[PDB]
Amino acid sequence: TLGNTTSSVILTNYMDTQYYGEIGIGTPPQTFKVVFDTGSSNVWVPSSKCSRLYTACVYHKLFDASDSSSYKHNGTELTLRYSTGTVSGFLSQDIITVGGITVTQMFGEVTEMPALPFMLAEFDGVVGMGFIEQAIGRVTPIFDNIISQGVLKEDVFSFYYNRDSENSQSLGGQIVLGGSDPQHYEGNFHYINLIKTGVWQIQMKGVSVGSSTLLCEDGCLALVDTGASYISGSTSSIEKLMEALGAKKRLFDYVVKCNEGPTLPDISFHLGGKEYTLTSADYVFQESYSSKKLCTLAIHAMDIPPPTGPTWALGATFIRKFYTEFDRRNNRIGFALAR
Numbered sequence: 049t050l051g052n053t054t055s056s057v058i059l060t061n062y063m064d065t066q067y068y069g070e071i072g073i074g075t076p077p078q079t080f081k082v083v084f085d086t087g088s089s090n091v092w093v094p095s096s097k098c099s100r101l102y103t104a105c106v107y108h109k110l111f112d113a114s115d116s117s118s119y120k121h122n123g124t125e126l127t128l129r130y131s132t133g134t135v136s137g138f139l140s141q142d143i144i145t146v147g148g149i150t151v152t153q154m155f156g157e158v159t160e161m162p163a164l165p166f167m168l169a170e171f172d173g174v175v176g177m178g179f180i181e182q183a184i185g186r187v188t189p190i191f192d193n194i195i196s197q198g199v200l201k202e203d204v205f206s207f208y209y210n211r212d213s214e215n216s217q218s219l220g221g222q223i224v225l226g227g228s229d230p231q232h233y234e235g236n237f238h239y240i241n242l243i244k245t246g247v248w249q250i251q252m253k254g255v256s257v258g259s260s261t262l263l264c265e266d267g268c269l270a271l272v273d274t275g276a277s278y279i280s281g282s283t284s285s286i287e288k289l290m291e292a293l294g295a296k297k298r299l300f301d302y303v304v305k306c307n308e309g310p311t312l313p314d315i316s317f318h319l320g321g322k323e324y325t326l327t328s329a330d331y332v333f334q335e336s337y338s339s340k341k342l343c344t345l346a347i348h349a350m351d352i353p354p355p356t357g358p359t360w361a362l363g364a365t366f367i368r369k370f371y372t373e374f375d376r377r378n379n380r381i382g383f384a385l386a387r
């Protein structure tokens with residue numbers, strides 16, 4: 049069932065690595081900063097039942113069920129094993145407000161939240177925008193529950209991620225539920241069908257580094273992940289990519305001499321009909337131009353295990369350049385040049 053509603057959520061951009069918006073949970077609402085994530089399918093926030101021996105729980109907003117009159121107990125154990133690590137807790141149900149839409153939702157109350165990486169997170173929790181097929185504990189995802197209300201104009205949602213500004217007047221980003229915002233893209237959308245329903249993943253035909261370097265020659269997979277900061281490839285693909293760029297490996301990231309940053313070649317992703325090109329300004333964190341300082345690249349290695357991986361992941365680095373529409377009705381992803 050389709051309605052006429054379109055709901056937008058304004059996002060805050062933290063350092064071009066974290067894009068989060070607000071949701072309200074319970075009666076009266078308890079607010080949380082959340083990443084709207086196409087790479088996962090569960091909703092979770094830290095819980096008041098999280099031991100304060102997990103320091104990430106000291107520095108984040110905690111959901112207190114004892115303060116909500118609309119809360120409904122469940123209690124089923126929940127373990128979410130992600131590429132960044134594990135969080136665990138239990139299931140709870142309450143009313144969630146997201147951009148004006150009110151939805152009764154089953155979510156995770158996280159009681160175990162590791163300092164690495166969550167002490168680095170400016171957000172509190174996660175709103176999984178992925179499919180029911182990948183939902184842990186077979187919990188109905190929030191977008192499926194919103195769709196069931198038959199209020200949305202279309203069975204789609206869109207992401208706009210802005211470049212980081214120091215001006216408070218700057219919109220960090222925007223998620224549209226039920227459509228796309230023509231003020232944040234130009235030209236037309238070009239769609240790529242999903243390999244299969246259940247994962248926001250598409251076929252990739254090749255990766256080009258300048259003129260003389262080529263990866264993904266026989267085709268590969270591309271997960272379009274709004275919850276990832278950087279573009280990621282397998283360890284093997286990234287070693288070849290970085291060698292081609294003249295970048296050196298550190299503990300978790302890759303760097304170039306800052307003065308060399310503006311000279312780096314274009315990187316192109318062949319998706320569906322089109323080539324999606326990122327210049328060095330799109331993937332280098334150009335913090336200085338010094339021959340004496342190292343500048344980080346917004347690309348790294350991540351070995352995603354089967355059945356989803358091995359796969360590349362097109363994170364915030366890609367979405368900043370290309371406004372993205374996630375189409376559930378047609379099982380496809382549309383890209384248009386962001387503005």
Ligand SMILES: CC(C)[C@]1(C)CC(=O)N(Cc2cc(F)cc(C(=O)N[C@@H](C)c3ccccc3)c2)C(N)=N1
Pocket residue numbers: 065066067083085086087088130131132133165166168169170174273274275276277278280350
């Ligand atoms: C949002 C994040 C907690 C989860 C739920 C789990 C995860 O591992 N990724 C993929 C992924 C893969 C990866 F290599 C890096 C990051 C990542 O750094 N995401 C940012 C948003 C972040 C910052 C601070 C703490 C955690 C995560 C995310 C994802 N899509 N969603």
Ligand SMILES: *[C@@H]1O[C@H](CO)[C@@H](O)[C@H](O)[C@H]1NC(C)=O
Pocket residue numbers: 121122123124139
């Ligand atoms: C938790 O919710 C699920 C929803 O399908 C239900 O099957 C399960 O029995 C619930 N558990 C309790 C103890 O309420």
